Amino acid sequence: TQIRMVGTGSAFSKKFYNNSALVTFTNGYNLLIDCGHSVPKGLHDADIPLESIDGILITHTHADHIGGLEEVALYNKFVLGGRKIDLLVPNTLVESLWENSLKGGLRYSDTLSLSDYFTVRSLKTFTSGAARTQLEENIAIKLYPTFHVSHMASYAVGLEDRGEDKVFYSSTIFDEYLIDTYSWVFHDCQFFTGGVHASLDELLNYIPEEDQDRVFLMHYGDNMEDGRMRFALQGRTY
Amino acid sequence: TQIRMVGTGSAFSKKFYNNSALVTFTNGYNLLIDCGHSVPKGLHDADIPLESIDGILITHTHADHIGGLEEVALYNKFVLGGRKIDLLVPNTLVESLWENSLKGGLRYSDTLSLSDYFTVRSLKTFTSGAARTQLEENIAIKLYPTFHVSHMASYAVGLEDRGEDKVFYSSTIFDEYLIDTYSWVFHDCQFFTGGVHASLDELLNYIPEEDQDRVFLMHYGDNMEDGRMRFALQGRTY
Ligand SMILES: [Zn+2]
Ligand SMILES: [Zn+2]
Ligand SMILES: [Zn+2]
Ligand SMILES: [Zn+2]
């Protein structure tokens, strides 16, 4: 079980791609978390063919995480002979994904629903706590509803491979009640206080406890020229 | 009056940016045609600061031409002290731009309408022919409704500087009835017959007339390793 950060920058970064995770499990299952407009290019830069993708997980209904979904359905239905793959989407983000964010239909293959391009795996969610959803024989996913922008639902995902909790992926603002009960933690990081992201200073305000060895930062601004926490390096495996 | 192609690739290209034109007129007016998700990065690569942008023209309500509009409003309202600039939008693409394509509101500066981030210049259009709309003392724009995808309106733009027709920008499928009554013509080009783009072979089917000196190709696929018509070179001025 190893992870590869396809992109690491924020929504408006120009040096790094859209923050997306490329997780490959012990049973050969390759999972991608979020697929923005520049994520398929980040996959083409990392020299991983898109034919190896088995499932895609979605935590946003915004451009930087769903931008490349139309391109993925383009590649699968046209070149790959309509290979319908997994689109792991939480239940509350299903109707908001197709009818709204994808204009109720794709551009090049106009009208059809989302079930024609992907095998929609509606994951279970609610608002007062976490939620577990099994996928394969040893692929489990814990979903935590994170607060990003008002009147919109974002989610954090945890991954369990054959029982053991492997990595906690936040995909979120500075949430006071964390769980890091996980081996590794990748957390959204910002360089300016306020807004709709967890800032670096807010992370250092909750840091004297030596859990810093586990924390990894991501989803940051473009001016990057940079305490025990190590940033997620784009193009670095495991 | 010179043009600079910021990006030249199609929606799914990875080597070139989103097809966008950077036009600077004789009166110092700098105009950008279409602003997709990778266009602000294409501006950062071309070493043109975004503070010099005077107006933005929109011919699509799709991701590859409106993706970067939220980033432009981000830069202007936050860093530039709320410098409201020109957003040249045809009349029929106004209500479809804000309520639908921009989720009825931006992410980082949540609720407000489009008039708070830009000075909406509603351009005049109709479906049976071209339409002229004056902007400044010597900035005129001719809008031709092009057919892209069904049940959606796209537009081609022509630019007249102090009277003379300078360039015809198609931004479209293979339209049989063209006007090239213009000095220069930039046309969408595709490498595969069918779809919703004008293909290269369809252009060569309408080519024995020696008007090829005027035609320039753009908005093409990524496999580019390539009759008198010359392709638009990314990063080439005038
Ligand atoms: Zn993100
Ligand atoms: Zn987010
Ligand atoms: Zn285009
Ligand atoms: Zn188009």
Author numbering:
A (entry chain A), B (entry chain A): 6 to 116, 120 to 179, 181 to 189, 193 to 238, 244 to 255
The authors write:
The cyclic oligonucleotide-based antiphage signalling system (CBASS) and the pyrimidine cyclase system for antiphage resistance (Pycsar) are antiphage defence systems in diverse bacteria that use cyclic nucleotide signals to induce cell death and prevent viral propagation. Here we show that phages encode anti-CBASS (Acb) and anti-Pycsar (Apyc) proteins that counteract defence by specifically degrading cyclic nucleotide signals that activate host immunity. Using a biochemical screen of 57 phages in Escherichia coli and Bacillus subtilis, we discover Acb1 from phage T4 and Apyc1 from phage SBSphiJ as founding members of distinct families of immune evasion proteins. We confirmed the critical role for Apyc1 metal-coordinating residues and identified E74 and Y112 from the opposing protomer as further catalytic residues required for cCMP hydrolysis and release of the reaction product 5′-CMP. Together, these findings demonstrate that Acb1 and Apyc1 constitute separate families of immune evasion proteins and explain the distinct reaction mechanisms that degrade CBASS or Pycsar cyclic nucleotide signals.
To compare mechanisms of anti-CBASS and anti-Pycsar evasion, we determined the crystal structure of Apyc1 from the phage Bsp38 (2.7 Å) as well as structures of Paenibacillus Apyc1 proteins (1.5 Å and 1.8 Å). Structures of Apyc1 reveal a metal-dependent cyclic NMP phosphodiesterase that uses relaxed specificity to target Pycsar cyclic pyrimidine mononucleotide signals. Structural comparison of Apyc1 and B. subtilis YhfI also reveals that Apyc1 enzymes contain an extended loop that reaches into the nucleotide-binding pocket, potentially enabling stable binding of smaller cyclic pyrimidine substrates. Recombinant protein produced from gene 147 rapidly degrades the Pycsar signals cCMP and cUMP, and we named this anti-Pycsar protein Apyc1 (European Nucleotide Archive genome accession number ERS1981056). SBSphiJ Apyc1 efficiently hydrolyses a wide range of cyclic mononucleotides, exhibiting an atypically relaxed nucleobase specificity that enables targeting of cyclic pyrimidine signals used in Pycsar immunity. By contrast, the closely related B. subtilis enzymes YhfI (GenBank accession number NP_388905.1) and MBL phosphodiesterase (GenBank accession number WP_013351727.1) exhibited a strong preference for cAMP/cGMP over cCMP/cUMP cleavage, confirming that relaxed nucleotide specificity and Pycsar signal degradation are unique to Apyc1 and not general features of MBL phosphodiesterase enzymes.
